[PDB]
Write a protein that binds this ligand. Sequence first.
Ligand SMILES: Nc1nc2c(ncn2[C@@H]2O[C@H](COP(=O)(O)OP(=O)(O)OP(=O)(O)O)[C@@H](O)[C@H]2O)c(=O)[nH]1
Ligand SMILES: Nc1nc2c(ncn2[C@@H]2O[C@H](COP(=O)(O)OP(=O)(O)OP(=O)(O)O)[C@@H](O)[C@H]2O)c(=O)[nH]1
Ligand SMILES: Nc1nc2c(ncn2[C@@H]2O[C@H](COP(=O)(O)OP(=O)(O)OP(=O)(O)O)[C@@H](O)[C@H]2O)c(=O)[nH]1
Lengths: 46, 427, 50, 438, 438
Amino acid sequence: TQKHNLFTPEPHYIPGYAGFYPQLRYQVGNTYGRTTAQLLTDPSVQ
Amino acid sequence: MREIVHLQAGQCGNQIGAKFWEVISDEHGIDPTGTYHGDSDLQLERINVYYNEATGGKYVPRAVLVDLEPGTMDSVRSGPFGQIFRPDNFVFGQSGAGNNWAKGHYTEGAELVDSVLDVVRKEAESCDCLQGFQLTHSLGGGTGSGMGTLLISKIREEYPDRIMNTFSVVPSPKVSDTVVEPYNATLSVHQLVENTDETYCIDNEALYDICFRTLKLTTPTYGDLNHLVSATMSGVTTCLRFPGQLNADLRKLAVNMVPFPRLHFFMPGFAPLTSRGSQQYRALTVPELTQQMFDAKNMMAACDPRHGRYLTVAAVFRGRMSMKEVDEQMLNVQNKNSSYFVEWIPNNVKTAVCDIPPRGLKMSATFIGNSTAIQELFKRISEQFTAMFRRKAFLHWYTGEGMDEMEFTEAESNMNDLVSEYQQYQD
Amino acid sequence: RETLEFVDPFRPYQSFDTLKRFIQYDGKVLRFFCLWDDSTSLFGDRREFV
Amino acid sequence: MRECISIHVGQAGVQIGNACWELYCLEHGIQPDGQMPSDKTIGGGDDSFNTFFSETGAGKHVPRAVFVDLEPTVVDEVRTGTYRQLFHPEQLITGKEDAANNYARGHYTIGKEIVDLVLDRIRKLADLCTGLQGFLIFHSFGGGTGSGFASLLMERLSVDYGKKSKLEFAIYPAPQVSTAVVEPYNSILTTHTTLEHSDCAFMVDNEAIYDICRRNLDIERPTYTNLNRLIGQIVSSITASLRFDGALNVDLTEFQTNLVPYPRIHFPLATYAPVISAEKAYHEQLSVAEITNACFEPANQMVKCDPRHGKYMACCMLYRGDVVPKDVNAAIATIKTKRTIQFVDWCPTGFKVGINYQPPTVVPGGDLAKVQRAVCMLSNTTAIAEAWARLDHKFDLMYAKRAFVHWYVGEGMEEGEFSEAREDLAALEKDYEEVGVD
Amino acid sequence: MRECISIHVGQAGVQIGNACWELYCLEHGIQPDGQMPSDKTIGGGDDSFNTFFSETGAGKHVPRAVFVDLEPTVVDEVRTGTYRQLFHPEQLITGKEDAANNYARGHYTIGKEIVDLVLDRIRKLADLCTGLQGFLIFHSFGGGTGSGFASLLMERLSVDYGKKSKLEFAIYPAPQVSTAVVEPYNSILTTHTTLEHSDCAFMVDNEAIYDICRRNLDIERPTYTNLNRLIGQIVSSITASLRFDGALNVDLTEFQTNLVPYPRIHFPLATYAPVISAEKAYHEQLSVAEITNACFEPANQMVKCDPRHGKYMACCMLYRGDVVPKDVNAAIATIKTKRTIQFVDWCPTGFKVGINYQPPTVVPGGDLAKVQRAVCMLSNTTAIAEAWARLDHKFDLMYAKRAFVHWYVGEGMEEGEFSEAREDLAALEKDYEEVGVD
Ligand SMILES: Nc1nc2c(ncn2[C@@H]2O[C@H](COP(=O)(O)OP(=O)(O)OP(=O)(O)O)[C@@H](O)[C@H]2O)c(=O)[nH]1
Ligand SMILES: Nc1nc2c(ncn2[C@@H]2O[C@H](COP(=O)(O)OP(=O)(O)OP(=O)(O)O)[C@@H](O)[C@H]2O)c(=O)[nH]1
Ligand SMILES: Nc1nc2c(ncn2[C@@H]2O[C@H](COP(=O)(O)OP(=O)(O)OP(=O)(O)O)[C@@H](O)[C@H]2O)c(=O)[nH]1
């Protein structure tokens, strides 16, 4: 569409959301911060 | 020796005291910091009527400041003389007032009274002998009325031998601001007339008029209003702290001034007001001081006595005069209009002459008068209260506080009694 | 009019805080060595401090 | 000290709090992170900010607000937005379903599991709060959810802490505009449950904001951004007295004690005079006379009622910025000299004045200009009776034809209370009539 | 002087022994190799690390722990861990076989040829040390092997030394999640054998640990690593008085002398208030009032017992970080005033205040935030009888159906002991009721 972006890397994702995020399926890791940090730091597809 | 303790009650009285104290201090030669500068022997001696002495020459006022809104006292402390005031006399509560007189008179004052009584009696024992107390407060402001009524009531039986000089500001006959002002004023004046002996009533409509008449700047502040009123009380207090072949004591004034127990209401008046250019366009001479003093436009407290008549008058001059000019001026006014006064009493004229002219001039004055002219004012408040009471709007708060409308009925009764006795005397 | 600009309020105040500096330099220490002379007193001579 | 607690609920009631707090950050110069410059203002949450923001040693002015919403969309959006770092994370109370515009759904099926959370949060605020003059609730009447949960929450707070005021500010139904037909029903239900617990309720309407925007601001396609900025500056004017000092100070308690004569009838109107465009404000002049004539101008009210159809019994004006008492009293005297505004016989005196020195401030990217002299007017009147007359003589047909009643009864209620509300309203109109009659 | 000995028995407690020692290396900066930074701390072992390590002339701190394990797996794993060079080889006593979850197998068949070795270790440690305040033993009630050898070793140390303290922290069985139906057997046997030898047994519930975790740490799949780290910080808090000093200091001896009202009953409970995440702590304020309120809130307890339905008698209350004792005593007085807590009449004062000005310390890669005010609460109440009621009304059924008794009689045991344990539990229950009823 003709609009903005979201999800700025690492510093991102305060606790509370409902909605999909990439590769949240391997979360043995615990703090929401590190979860989201790895989630964005792994866009490795391309 | 004889000293005075000042009461600075409610938010009005707070800024009134700010201006008043800085005026007295600036005239009397004490710096804002506290380190006096040696200029004047006589002030250096008579400073003890008001200011007590710390070490080094730094002077503590004998004043008690009270309010309920912490920000008010924050601003007062912020003014140029918070450092000349003490935290010791800073006492306050936590709850906002709403300017509800019943609130100020039965619920939170009921516990705020004790501490202020203890502190004031501390200072009263610290000193030697007072003659009384001067109170600065409001009758149209909520907290002032609600608290000061209780305070004056209790101090009356604390010490039955002292003068309750009262200084209460009066709401505008054209805009009362606080819509419950009728109720506040009536309830307050009920105990005023009982406890007080002498009272000065001040209305700011005449202040606005005089701002358009001689102040002539058209862009004024309540600070300027306080300037004028503070100067007036300065003048009434000057005689004590200064030499001269005159009598000074407030009692020497009051026992001369009032004939009957139920006569308490008083009219401040001032002396030469100087405009834009009247400085170098004026000659400060006895006839013109006399004229301006007696002038109706000059009068600024309540309203023109042109409708009514005088009962007593007193005047305090301050300058290098002689007795003959003031006596002949008194005869001149007496025989110019020997009708506007009352044939009951002769010699309705009271005089005092101090020899210590103020700072900046060479002779000055001040005028106080008791005249049958407050009839219109408390008559107005009568119609206000009745026309409200006929449908008891807003009374749910006062009933929830928990009193009866009967008490209101006795208040209006006492008010009408004052009306009736003023009428029945003058006419 | 400087008095009338003195009458122009801002409601001022000042206070203090510790946490940010505390954390910024949390868990670091400088290490330095020194010596005190003692032979002035007729019993002690030397001792070393850190 | 001088602090109050802020509350917002509903799709209706979220962007408004968003904008109001976006205004609240400016005057203290809050960097959108939440940190002051190296200059010195932080402490134990004790300075000009303390009336709104709790800045303990963290160096972050943590707001004293509570946003609650049943639907995750907009709350997640603002959590994605600018100041989510400034906002308290779990404080943002979130649900997974709606009230389906049904008051009774919002009041009996889903509210029962959220009150415990909200009570925990509010009292954990209250413990560290010291003064706590009162609350500041934001909801809606005909809202899809702001009816039922709002009513239940105000019930519980009014029955647990009954020794303090409550200020209700709400968006009144549009008189000849509708967004949902549930609005008559849920509006009257909310009103009849409230009035016996509400203290001072201020109604606003959006059609008049619309008309104003091109009446003098002259942007013909404004938005919610503009609406929210306007109501924001309204609440900023009403909180200025707490924020700073002035010639004379006024307080919410004074509002409570003065503006309302009687219980039941506690429904004032506002008006903000100098809404005007940038170049208009720049190259036009302002003073107390014209701004007061503007505040009493009969076309600028945010309720399409006519004061000269109605009457007047009590008024309160709050002036912000450079003023003097002289011209103020002169202008009010002239207004009394006028003969069109018909004050009742009841109060021959009816004007509550207030002054604050600090001028109102622009917002960056704001449709306003710099102000020097602002005046917010709060008046009580009887003309509003025509609006409730409108609402009842619309509700009559609906309750006659008993439409949509399955929607309510199947989710659990009955009709006795729906009957009862209509004579509650009729009581309101008859009260208006008798008190208005001299 | 002031130094203690640590014991960890059971592949249950191995992770937590590992974790607590990992955390203990941090605050003294003990590099994982065994040496320090370029700084000078090496000597005979009289300085801050003196209470947990004995560092000799080559500068290698010696942990004063004993890791006893029966199944080579976990001991080999930890010995392959990072701190292997730190640890001591035959302080890591390893065995081959298990107890088959059987208390009697672990109490009569295997250990009788291992207690010689473990006693030799403990005695040559005791001879070298001088302070010897006591032992800190970790085992597991829901223990396949952390139960039998635990009982045997505690019996032997009771019968060889009798003038020091014994402190034991044991993971409780879950109220409704049984990882093994051998629990009803082994738990009560261990309990009745220990009652007259154990000093002050403490316990905790891992389900409740998880509950708190996803409550305010907001983590959805936490691990054993977190479960262990938190309790490690707990024991750090309870030995801070040994570690640093403060305004006042308290010790295990005082806990022994003060936290148990009568013989037998020595089952307290624990709570740690500021278990919080990074941004929560970063921009939400902490202070004595709210932290004490949180630690007295019923849901924060790590054992499922409603405080309200039972009765409190004992409280010991230890603050770590900066705090001014004025607010401490003010807050505790306010708690006494608060109605909701229902004290018994026997001890009108029952509080044990303790202060250490040393702040708690974080762990690298950690999931705790930074704290300048924290507290551990260690209290005793009467409600705990519910758990014993639960386990006994399970065991009565399972015994009356004598399920699995073949195992235990075959490995060589009889039923008189079963009875003895049963009516010992019965006696403790009526003792609880007698002490409760005032
Ligand atoms: N000091 C001061 N007083 C003012 C000023 N303007 C008006 N006032 C009057 O002062 C009155 C009362 O002051 P207080 O003695 O403190 O009375 P109160 O019980 O606090 O009641 P209110 O102030 O009226 O709410 C107010 O009612 C005003 O009418 C002003 O500029 N300065
Ligand atoms: N208070 C407020 N009302 C608005 C705003 N914008 C539109 N409205 C009106 O407010 C009403 C919103 O009601 P609802 O949509 O029911 O809000 P709700 O009850 O919280 O629940 P939902 O229907 O699920 O969103 C609409 O009828 C709009 O006409 C706004 O910014 N603030
Ligand atoms: N202390 C601790 N307990 C754990 C851990 N993981 C699971 N548990 C719980 O601890 C108990 C483990 O005890 P047991 O399995 O009997 O251990 P054991 O007696 O030493 O012998 P094994 O059966 O070989 O493990 C179980 O009830 C678990 O519910 C852990 O890492 N540490």
